[PDB]
Amino acid sequence: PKHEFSVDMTCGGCAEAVSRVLNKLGGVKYDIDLPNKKVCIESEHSMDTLLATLKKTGKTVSYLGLE
Amino acid sequence: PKHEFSVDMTCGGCAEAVSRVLNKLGGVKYDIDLPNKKVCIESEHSMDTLLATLKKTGKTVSYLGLE
Ligand SMILES: [Cu+2]
Numbered sequence: 001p002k003h004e005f006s007v008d009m010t011c012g013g014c015a016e017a018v019s020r021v022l023n024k025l026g027g028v029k030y031d032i033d034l035p036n037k038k039v040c041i042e043s044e045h046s047m048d049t050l051l052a053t054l055k056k057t058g059k060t061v062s063y064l065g066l067e
Numbered sequence: 068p069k070h071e072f073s074v075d076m077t078c079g080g081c082a083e084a085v086s087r088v089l090n091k092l093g094g095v096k097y098d099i100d101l102p103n104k105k106v107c108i109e110s111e112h113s114m115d116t117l118l119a120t121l122k123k124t125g126k127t128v129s130y131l132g133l134e
Contacts, residue, residue: 014080
């Protein structure tokens with residue numbers, strides 16, 4: 001499944017921190033779009049696990065949906 | 068005790084993120100100096116706990132010692 005999240009990243013540092021928490025979770029393939037404040041994640045991890053992982057950053061996160 | 072950490076924050080968004088994770092931990096009095104990449108924390112929480120809480124952000128964190 002391909003999950004789509006809004007994450008309120010406002011600098012390259014914010015983007016890199018997202019990548020680091022996702023790397024720590026593992027079992028993910030992702031792309032981070034800074035100008036559109038979007039993270040897409042291909043994973044077998046649950047929506048809730050991915051959400052909780054992103055929210056660890058301390059950034060505002062919401063779920064946009066799924067393919 | 069009064070602990071000091073370096074946290075590699077590059078924008079105000081990064082400072083907010085640090086604020087949010089520390090608020091969620093609770094039992095802390097902190098100040099964040101964004102241009103100097105420094106976070107001072109007065110807490111009864113162990114250094115270990117504060118370090119782990121800061122590293123949750125996915126930002127690079129190091130320990131600048133007791134005041
Ligand atoms: Cu930032």
